[PDB]
Amino acid sequence: DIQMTQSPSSLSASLGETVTITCXXXXXXXXXXXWYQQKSGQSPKLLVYXXXXXXXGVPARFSGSGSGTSYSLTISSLQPEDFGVYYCXXXXXXXXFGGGTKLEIKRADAAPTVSIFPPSSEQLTSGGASVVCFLNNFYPKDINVKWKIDGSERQNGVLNSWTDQDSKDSTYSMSSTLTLTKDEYERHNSYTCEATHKTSTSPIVKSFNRNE
């Protein structure tokens, strides 16, 4: 009945930069703590046990320390394999895990390439109408999009999907889909997909006219 709390919910750091992950214990654990490294779509792997004993195959960059009730995991010179998700566990009482720490690569900011697509003819015959907006190869992941219909924002019926950080260019991509009925689609002419990002103060504006 001891809970593990990790202070960094999510951390972004450049390659080779030092980073410390702290795991706090609700009570004394007397060592017997383990850290697990999990990649995207992968099973957890044992990294360091007894809070100070690195596992087999673990490079010397990883290190653990214990100062009271706060156990810390330290990586000084990050490598591309080091990026992922990390968890701490307590092995004294019944086992429990922490909240998780998602480590991601930090790079220079990039502008989102925004593309907007009107609903296809095939979808119109079925009865639906979805306007798809693509935002590819942008950093950081934090971005907000707005759907303007003839100048009026709509906060209903919009669903977004964020891809995992790219392995090649270490960027992010986002797709925003606004789904509405055919009748509601034909009640307006101009559909605009605007996104506010740190790259530019003015949001990038892409739009089209329904009357092709």
Contact set with another protein (CB under 8 A): 30-32, 34, 36, 38, 43-46, 49-50, 53, 87, 89, 91-100, 113, 115, 117-123, 126, 128, 130, 132, 134, 136, 159, 161, 163-164, 173, 175, 177, 179, 208-209, 212
The position carrying tokens 């992950």 is 21
CB of 130 to another protein, least distance (A): 7
Report CA 91 to chain centroid distance, whole Å.
29
Nearer to another protein, 9 or 152 (CB): 9
- Measured from the CB atom, the residue of 76 and 192 that comes closer to another protein is 192
CA distance 54 to 11: 22
Distance CA 189, CA 201 (A): 27
Cβ at position 36, least distance to another protein in Å: 7
Q: Of the two residues 82 and 89, which places its CB atom closer to another protein in the complex?
A: 89
Residues of the chain by 3-state class (helix, strand, coil), percent to 5: 5, 50, 40
- 20/136 with CB nearer another protein: 136
Supply 130's token pair. 């979805």
Burial class (CB in 10 A: 0-12, 13-18, 19+), 73: buried
Residue carrying structure tokens 């504006």: 205
Amino acid at site 56: X
Q: How far is the CB of 23 from another protein (least distance, A)?
A: 12
Nearer to another protein, 89 or 139 (CB): 89
Rounded to a whole number of angstroms, the minimum distance from the CB of residue 77 to another protein is 26
The owner of tokens 């290190």 is 63
